[PDB]
Symmetry: D2
Subunit: 321 residues, 4 copies
Amino acid sequence: CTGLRFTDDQGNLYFGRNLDVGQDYGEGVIITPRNYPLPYKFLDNTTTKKAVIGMGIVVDGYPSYFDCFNEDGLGIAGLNFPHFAKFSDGPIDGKINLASYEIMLWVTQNFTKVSDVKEALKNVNLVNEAINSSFAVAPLHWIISDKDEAIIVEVSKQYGMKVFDDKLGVLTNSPDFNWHLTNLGNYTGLDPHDATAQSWNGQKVAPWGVGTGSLGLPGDSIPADRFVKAAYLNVNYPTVKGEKANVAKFFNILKSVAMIKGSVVNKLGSDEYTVYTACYSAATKTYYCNFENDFELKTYKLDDETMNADKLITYHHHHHH
Amino acid sequence: CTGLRFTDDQGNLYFGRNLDVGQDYGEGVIITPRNYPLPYKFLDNTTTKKAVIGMGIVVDGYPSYFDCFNEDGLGIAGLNFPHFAKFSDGPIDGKINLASYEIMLWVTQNFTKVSDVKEALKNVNLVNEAINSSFAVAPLHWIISDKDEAIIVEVSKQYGMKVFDDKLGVLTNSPDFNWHLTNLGNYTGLDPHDATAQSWNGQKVAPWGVGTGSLGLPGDSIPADRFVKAAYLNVNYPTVKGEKANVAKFFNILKSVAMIKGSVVNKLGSDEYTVYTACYSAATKTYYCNFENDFELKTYKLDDETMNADKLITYHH
Amino acid sequence: CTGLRFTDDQGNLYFGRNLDVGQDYGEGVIITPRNYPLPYKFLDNTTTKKAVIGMGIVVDGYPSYFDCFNEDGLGIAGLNFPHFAKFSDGPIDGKINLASYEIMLWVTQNFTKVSDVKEALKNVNLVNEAINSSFAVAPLHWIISDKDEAIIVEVSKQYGMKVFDDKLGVLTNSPDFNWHLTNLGNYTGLDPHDATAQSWNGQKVAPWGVGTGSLGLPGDSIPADRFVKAAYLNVNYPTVKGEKANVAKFFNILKSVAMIKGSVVNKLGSDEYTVYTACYSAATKTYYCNFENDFELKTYKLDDETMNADKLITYHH
Amino acid sequence: CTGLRFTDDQGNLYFGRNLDVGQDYGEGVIITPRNYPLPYKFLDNTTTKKAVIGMGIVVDGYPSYFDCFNEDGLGIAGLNFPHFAKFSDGPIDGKINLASYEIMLWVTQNFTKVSDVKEALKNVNLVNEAINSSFAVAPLHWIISDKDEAIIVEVSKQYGMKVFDDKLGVLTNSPDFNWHLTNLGNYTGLDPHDATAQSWNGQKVAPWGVGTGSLGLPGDSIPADRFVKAAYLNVNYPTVKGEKANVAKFFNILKSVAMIKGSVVNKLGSDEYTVYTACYSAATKTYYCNFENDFELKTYKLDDETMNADKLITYHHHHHH
Ligand code: NA
Ligand code: NA
Ligand code: NA
Ligand code: NA
Ligand code: NA
Ligand code: NA
């Protein structure tokens, strides 16, 4: 998985992710309206105050989001953080205790600014508890973004709870976020500018085509390599204008770092690949996505009808794997 | 540029290209109908026998294609071959003489099988002449494909005229095709299968995520590196069923090797990037494309209305 | 710089380093005999109990070692740790307080087992102080080894004091050791075993020569890349028998990851390169080294003559 | 195998090779003196006119060299060219016909200048014939050098006989030499000069140590990769002064691209590695070498005694594999 965000010239946010997996989870687009029941394991039960849209599954009426975005332009995506993620084995007295699956709706229901999220997380404790005993706890880390900043939330057995500022606007998988930031120092030899003709002891050595400045840019799907490439692409892509151009820019970047079907086979014999790419446009409250076997963009929207429905709106699962 | 072709389980062909350029050319989708005036510089002027569709520009009523595909399911794409391509100084009596730009229509108008194209190419001579003195001659090589086989056509100062069978189904830019084929042997260490945990003198060293078998796969836009990656993806992508899934598979592969805006700046200071990606489905006679700033798929079709038109059908730029 | 250690089949240790620098330091081989005056900035001055040998310079009668090894077979090498290393602003009552440069002799004079070194390091505080105001404090980390185990000692502004077990037997430069250990999981696709011939949709794609399994192994001098390669070579090099073969194995590995003159130019315009490679054999108490401009192995030895000298034995620069 | 040559400031040649193999050939240093019998399969038998030194084996009194160097400063090394090398299946009327193993002594016995070799090769035909029927024909290509130029000689089923000028002063194995020259164009992004600190959308990204300009330089033992690295090292290594510094410079480069034991296992299960590195200094007529298990330099010399001996001088084989 790769998460990506950036803005246009006017501060309109484009924020989303590839879902790169080795099996089918039965997910679909879910719109959760305002005033929908919202239970918490360790806090007072309440109701939703903001409408949200995203991909996920529904478990006993609870929308369990892979990624989700509120009507006020703040979103969050959960990505795998295997061999690192480790949550508290129980709630801690005095903290805001959240089972780790509850962070999706806790963030999107209570905040519009990432600066506020960052301050509130100082008293948050994530707990190793599933929605019910038929589910395992997913070892996630998260990217959260508004139009002004993205932050990374990681809780690991190795480092405890860390919240990073993410000026690159990207996130992939393991290892931890500081590791990937530090790795970028080893790729400072990269340069978008082409090389030109050279003399190697009088032998002319010259580029055969464009692209030679990015020698060493990795093209495989190892999480560290997708991180380097996605960060390099995002910071070098010019700001563009208009909804169509920004959505297209978003899919250009994430399709460049997609996991292509047949090129990755996991240790159990199963293909791992990008099953969907999704982009939320805050300015239009539109969730765009396409699928490995269905490339035309689909759109789903928060509007005066969907934001005020009396139940969840769930689009039937598009099948894969 | 990257050209790409494959088939589904029934022998339906999906064939197209990325256009990676550092300038605007004014191109759009052009349907050339049957019975359209077809002049030749060194042969008898004639008219078209088959409708074709593709991206190009129109010059004095002549459709100048970047890629084009005929109603019978044979197509051709022209890609830059800089520092290599060279054509004859002029025509040679005894040969089928074509100015290099005329090979697009020459191929799609007269053939439906690639086997026939390669047989006819033994009597062909490509001439270094543009349509007129206002345009330079493009230093192109070509990929040509039907449902059974793809071939590469290269004419170089270094090697003369060469025609290769292309079982990888891909083409990029310079150097020559045999160079790229040879390069693949240096990447036999690539493996779609993930590595697993290892003991480095008792230190556990294990993958952090999936993908470790393709260590060393290049992600830059150098033509040699796009060639390796496009070939590796195409030959490992499973065969899929139906029009929707095959069109998506095509765009999945070509967007993976796209040249991303801002990541390549040429020596004149211009961004080079994939301005469009196009896929022709022979089974539906449909040309699909999207663009750098408009990601939705647009579709254009050879049907009884467009194949029999009384003019060129030129969509917008 | 790259530090390296391994043992033979009998537990004899071979341990040393490349020195990769962009300037001349005036160094030479220094044998410090038993009973030599050993001052400390924050402890009782004393004298040496064990003879040591290594590369260094002498400052006001004090042997300032780049690496050094004691007669009992324990050694230590100091390597640059830029952008990370930071020591205390001053001494802290209750701790064993050492100016960072004194850790070379502190370790080699008081210990013969690495297990004891790591136990004692829990009460140690390294201070940002040079021998005098004429020299800057070097931002070092250290590899320490006996025949059983090697450990890394890192004191950073980011993480404080850290001591790692080093089963790979290697150390380079920045970033921190845990970062490098973690990086190895991204290279689990490396395999000493060659690939063999493959069918890419019927195109035979086969290795041109041996080596294809290590596709993606980096050959540049970035510290992360030298770390990966040195670790990969060390853990895959077979155990060999006898002094000659083990010394050669050591130099084979370190010359493979040497920084080659002219291939690295720092931001001040100076060539950075491996000026010497040195190997200490504990079994023969012999320090072997060669230099960028003199490849023959030179040897220096701790024996009953040199261990009991009445001065420092300083060989030439 | 990697072949390497360069000169000092005064035109003194340093020329030699790594021998990277998966089995033991029983080779040793051989000095062939002047006036030694010199048979030819397809030419008049004669005697040696120049003394030569190098590594090889002796077959029925014939010194069969892996590499060899004459007293006048011209040398040749044979390297494997598998899947390419193909010699004529018989002598051709009117040509200078040489069985391919005869090129070692034909070159070193008749020439002092590579310019003359290049002209004479225009009438040479290499023949697919072994010294006797107990030996197979080795699929070799060759690097030949004097103090002024090195040339590459390749005869392939693919391209016929080709003679290249080699300004890089290096050679490895397959594929063909023009392929490797052309490959260099893809590495024009390499630069000995370090990168410096950068701003990736405000995130400081800076080198952790020196070396960052050579991102993408390969360190594996694939022949194409050793070619790139050896060429890059050779053309960037400064000219140095004096016998000791030039010999050391030579071994520095070839030990950098050596095949390290245990890191390469061929498809039959055997370790492939650099068993010896050898350097001939034309100025001192000295053959320097060391071995995988014996690192101290050994020396062997053409002098007034060895050049005028009445039989071959053969040093006993140093064992490996
Ligand atoms: Na509750
Ligand atoms: Na570069
Ligand atoms: Na005509
Ligand atoms: Na004191
Ligand atoms: Na591999
Ligand atoms: Na004869």
